[PDB]
Amino acid sequence: FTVKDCDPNTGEIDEEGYEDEYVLEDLEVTVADHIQKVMKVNFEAAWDEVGDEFEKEETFTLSTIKTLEEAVGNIVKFLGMHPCERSDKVPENKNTHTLLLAGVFRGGHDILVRSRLLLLDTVTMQVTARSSEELPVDIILASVG
Amino acid sequence: EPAMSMDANGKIIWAKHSEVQQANLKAMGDTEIKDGERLPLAVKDMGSCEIYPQTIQHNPNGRFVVVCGDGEYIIYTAMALRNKSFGSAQEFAWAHDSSEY
């Protein structure tokens, strides 16, 4: 900006004044500015289907902590989607969990996620992102973080 | 020295003169001239602290200065002319990053 001084009493607004620039804050763009979180038009089918065309994967095996919760903090909250297919709920503890989760991404097509968190007693887990849009499968796996 | 630190826009804001009030900081200038030859300043004080310093150090982005004097540290929010913060020292490091100390 070109920075101009004020008199608030009665001012002056004149062509001159000199610039300095100040660095502003980052904008990060989310996976929730774009999405409508949903319930499926056809989960059974869709669920699978989305796999069919779309599916990328990441696996981790969890050996120092046996808790979802960290993961959980990043996922419900980052994606802004619904955990489910009756596979959401956990009390202050729970043995196993799946979020098979929903919403639709911008540009029309959908971004779909299944997270099977598996507890043997370590957690090893299958995160699936399946999508009706290509950019989202790679994204979900990242974005969730 | 006085206590001053310069924003790379081009304002070395110092304070005081030698024992004058701190009331005097500023300098964005406005003009250009030859290497050997000499230059003009702007005029618009801010400040009129009390504590008498001997350090000025800019924030790592010039920005937040922490100034120590009388043995305590006033940090200023500078443009703000706000006290960014204060306490008593002994010795210092900014976490260079520009976010801790």
Swiss-Prot record, chain A:
The coatomer is a cytosolic protein complex that binds to dilysine motifs and reversibly associates with Golgi non-clathrin-coated vesicles, which further mediate biosynthetic protein transport from the ER, via the Golgi up to the trans Golgi network. Coatomer complex is required for budding from Golgi membranes, and is essential for the retrograde Golgi-to-ER transport of dilysine-tagged proteins. Belongs to the COPG family. It is found in: Cytoplasm, Cytosol; Golgi apparatus membrane; Cytoplasmic vesicle, COPI-coated vesicle membrane. It comes from the Eukaryota. The lineage of its organism: Eukaryota, Metazoa, Chordata, Craniata, Vertebrata. It comes from Mus musculus. Oligomeric complex that consists of at least the alpha, beta, beta', gamma, delta, epsilon and zeta subunits. Interacts with ZNF289/ARFGAP2 through its C-terminal appendage domain. Interacts with EGFR upon EGF treatment; interaction is essential for regulation of EGF-dependent nuclear transport of EGFR by retrograde trafficking from the Golgi to the ER. The coatomer interacts with KDEL receptors; the interaction is important for retrograde trafficking of KDEL-bearing proteins from the Golgi to the endoplasmic reticulum. Interacts with COPB1. Interacts with TMED10 (via C-terminus). This is Coatomer subunit gamma-1.
Swiss-Prot record, chain B:
Oligomeric complex that consists of at least the alpha, beta, beta', gamma, delta, epsilon and zeta subunits. Probably interacts with PEX11A. Interacts with SCYL1. Interacts with JAGN1. It is found in: Cytoplasm, Cytosol; Golgi apparatus membrane; Cytoplasmic vesicle, COPI-coated vesicle membrane. The coatomer is a cytosolic protein complex that binds to dilysine motifs and reversibly associates with Golgi non-clathrin-coated vesicles, which further mediate biosynthetic protein transport from the ER, via the Golgi up to the trans Golgi network. Coatomer complex is required for budding from Golgi membranes, and is essential for the retrograde Golgi-to-ER transport of dilysine-tagged proteins. Disruption phenotype: The knockout of the gene results in early embryonic lethality with no viable embryos recovered at 12.5 dpc. It comes from the Eukaryota. This is Coatomer subunit beta'. The lineage of its organism: Eukaryota, Metazoa, Chordata, Craniata, Vertebrata. WD repeats lie at residues 48-86. Belongs to the WD repeat COPB2 family. The chain holds residues 303 to 403 of 905 of the full protein. It comes from Mus musculus (Mouse).
